Amino acid sequence: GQQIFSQALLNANRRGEAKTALAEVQARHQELLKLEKSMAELTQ
């Protein structure tokens, strides 16, 4: 005769993968921007 709650904790899981889903998009993004710049010159 009593009753219980529950809680959450965010675990390295996100400490890494979610921060990586910023760093690893913008950085591959940096590679893609470089590609785009080179293609622009090539097309010219």
Partner: peptide
């Protein structure tokens, strides 16, 4: 590794076209 390869090929092609 694929895209770097692509970048490398594009850079080579730019060189040939400048030539």
């Amino acid at each position: 590794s694929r895209t770097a390869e692509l970048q490398a090929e594009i850079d080579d092609t730019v060189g040939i076209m400048r030539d």
